[PDB]
Scaffold this motif. Sequence first.
Motif, PDB file in Angstrom:
ATOM      1  N   UNK A  11       4.539  40.759   2.579  1.00  0.00           N
ATOM      2  CA  UNK A  11       5.600  41.484   1.891  1.00  0.00           C
ATOM      3  C   UNK A  11       5.260  42.969   1.897  1.00  0.00           C
ATOM      4  N   UNK A  64      13.897  39.166   0.154  1.00  0.00           N
ATOM      5  CA  UNK A  64      13.857  39.886  -1.109  1.00  0.00           C
ATOM      6  C   UNK A  64      15.172  40.582  -1.429  1.00  0.00           C
ATOM      7  N   UNK A  65      16.000  40.865  -0.426  1.00  0.00           N
ATOM      8  CA  UNK A  65      17.278  41.515  -0.685  1.00  0.00           C
ATOM      9  C   UNK A  65      18.403  40.532  -0.968  1.00  0.00           C
ATOM     10  N   UNK A  84      15.117  46.081   4.459  1.00  0.00           N
ATOM     11  CA  UNK A  84      15.475  45.330   5.663  1.00  0.00           C
ATOM     12  C   UNK A  84      15.963  46.204   6.821  1.00  0.00           C
ATOM     13  N   UNK A  93      10.445  38.850   5.268  1.00  0.00           N
ATOM     14  CA  UNK A  93      10.169  38.969   3.840  1.00  0.00           C
ATOM     15  C   UNK A  93      11.026  40.045   3.185  1.00  0.00           C
ATOM     16  N   UNK A  94      11.452  41.051   3.950  1.00  0.00           N
ATOM     17  CA  UNK A  94      12.427  42.000   3.429  1.00  0.00           C
ATOM     18  C   UNK A  94      13.822  41.393   3.395  1.00  0.00           C
ATOM     19  N   UNK A  95      14.091  40.425   4.274  1.00  0.00           N
ATOM     20  CA  UNK A  95      15.351  39.691   4.216  1.00  0.00           C
ATOM     21  C   UNK A  95      15.401  38.783   2.996  1.00  0.00           C
TER      22      UNK A  95
END
Lengths: 96, 436, 48, 48, 49, 97, 97
Positions: free
Chosen positions: F30, D7-8, F35, D3-5
């Motif tokens: 989330x 969003x970036x 990352x 989910x951090x992948x």
Amino acid sequence: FRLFVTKPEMFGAATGAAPAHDALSLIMLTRFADWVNALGEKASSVLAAFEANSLTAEQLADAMNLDANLLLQASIQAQNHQHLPPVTPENAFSCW
Amino acid sequence: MQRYAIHAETALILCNAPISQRSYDNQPSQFDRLFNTPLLNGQYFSTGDEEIDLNSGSTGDWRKTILKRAFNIDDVSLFRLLKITDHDNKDGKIKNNLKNLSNLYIGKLLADIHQLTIDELDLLLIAVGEGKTNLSAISDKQLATLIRKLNTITSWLHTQKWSVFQLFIMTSTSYNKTLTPEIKNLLDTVYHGLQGFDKDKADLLHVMAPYIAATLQLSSENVAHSVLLWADKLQPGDGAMTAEKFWDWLNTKYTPGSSEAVETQEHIVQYCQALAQLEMVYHSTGINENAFRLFVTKPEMFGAATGAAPAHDALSLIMLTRFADWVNALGEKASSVLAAFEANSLTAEQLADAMNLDANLLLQASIQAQNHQHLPPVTPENAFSCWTSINTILQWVNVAQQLNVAPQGVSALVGLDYIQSMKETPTYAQWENAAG
Amino acid sequence: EEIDLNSGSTGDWRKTILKRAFNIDDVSLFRLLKITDHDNKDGKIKNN
Amino acid sequence: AEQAYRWELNDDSARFIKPGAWQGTYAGLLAGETLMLSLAQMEDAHLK
Amino acid sequence: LKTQQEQTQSQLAFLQRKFSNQALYNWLRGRLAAIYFQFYDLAVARCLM
Amino acid sequence: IYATPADPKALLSAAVATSQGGGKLPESFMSLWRFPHMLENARGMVSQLTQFGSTLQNIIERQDAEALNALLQNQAAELILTNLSIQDKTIEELDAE
Amino acid sequence: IYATPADPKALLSAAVATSQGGGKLPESFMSLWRFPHMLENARGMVSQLTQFGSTLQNIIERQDAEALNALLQNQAAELILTNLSIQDKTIEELDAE
């Protein structure tokens, strides 16, 4: 062993009864265990067809190394005589 | 009489002759000592136009009983003896002809002299490839070929210590449709492993091969790629499944862990049990890992027809074992012959170095293999690049070393054929040179 | 008299006696000649 | 980390973690080695 | 000797029904070697980076 | 007439494998971290899952090695009863000789 | 005349090794990171490739150790059939003595 503790009516017990563990029921588990060991490499294909209701006489005679018509004629004569657990065409190869 | 230790009248039945009805030496006839050696309840069994019901579940008349006493079988094996004899018989009823009794008796002798049951005979004739031929309509030439194929395979199963039921697993083309837990582990491991598969970037058979070998108990991925590549040439099962059709079903219709019946599920189990049969074929016939790839890619190198799928019947499992016994007899020079055999650069001088034979011995055996009429003909092009031709040349060595002669000394005996003499008779001197 | 000792020549009765006296076939009799005479071009020798 | 992948790099449809690393038949013995490959596929796709 | 046949079969049944049999390490080798090649193409990529 | 006994039969047993179902992926979350900081959080989380799996593989191998040794001693304690009855028949022979 | 049997032959088998082809290097990529930050990224990437290789070497050794033990029990179950037929001929002798 999971099929014994969930569906004992597959192994000769009455429908809706707890699976017994007396001396008459330990013979049945051993004669079942000696039966699946006699099948060898085709034991998993019979027990998968025995957990479902799709076990036939032609599939069993392949694993028993018998003639296909031998288990057919044995299944016909088992239904025409008066066994006290009666053999019907519905439970001919789905009850132990 | 010598091969199977039987009498002359029993060997006469195996040569497509009817049952004799004549006394010999104040002993009863062959027809009487089979059917009437005691009379069954004072009734003589004679041939006529009477029907004999031979079904598996018919308590017939006294004539069916005498067929069971003369053949030493029950009702069930007597119906299967009829299907070995007559595939075209719709019902079980036959006539009481001498031609029909001799055809039931010729089928029972094929099980007796090879120490087989009628079940072990019917499963063998399917494995031979003669499972669609009638004994009632067989000729003299086809019957001697049929007994020769039964003589070759049963004596081979004694050296391999296999049963007929063990051979039938490796030769069957009809498969079971029941989803076992051993196939569920194959369907799950291939599904979760090939999720990000691109068709253009990689071959399908190569990337399935780590996940096919993980669930068929294979020690190599080189073997599993040859396992998958062979099944694309048969298209086994009722669905004619390739490995490309196998993934299109498994990607779009299979759910891992479910007990739900999928639409074409039974055609998948027939494909996954053909891959498990391949695991038994590779480990039983102890063939090399590289040479098993040469069998599944180029079967014309191993005696098959050009452009045909490599067969797996009982005649083709002997060829893989005799090839495997051949490369084991080479020893340390086995890798240098098979590398020269995968290319077309294998010579007689290179082979005699590995066979520990004389160089001119395989040269003269190769010359005499080309000058005689073998039904697969040995040519100078395929003299050491086809396995049927190398098996042919090595038989000229095995006969010449048996007779302690040269390969042209064996060919001198072939020229003394009586049928070949009708075009050009050998003189007494040519026999006199061959006797010396 | 000549005796043809090649590996693939069904010779006369004199080659047969050389095989009986030595207990070898045609192939080992040609190699026995090459052990004896490397300078022999053909297989034929004299009966000396 | 997925989910951090997403969003970036503005790719909500991106998926690297797949529900097959745990096999209850074999007690999931290669669960860590499968997820470590999926984290390596995620970062190598992030660096590009 | 009929006991020793019964005991040899009780060992052969144990080697085929335990969890750490040959069928486990055929799966562990065949799955990891598919991971170990796909991890190599990512590991040699950052040696180039 | 003298009848020979039957040949010794070959024993055989079944090796029916098991198959447990596959699992489903839980719902994603989330978090707050970026990352390169959550991947390093996840990589040390998965590298501990590798050490648990290598430890669990060691325990199963030691479990099946001790279950075999307890089987080998219960079988060796059964053959010693038969060989001690044969020795009773050796002494009984020497009292009969 | 009495003819002696032939001497026992020595068995031999082949050990033909395999050879798979070498691979080619993929195309390089110019990333954003400097040399001391991508080398540390690559060193932890290769040190995990070492742990996968030491794990894969362990699994092959355990695979060939369990494939041998399954071979040793299938061979011991074959010799017990012959030794049980010799014992039938020992009892048949004592009925003939």
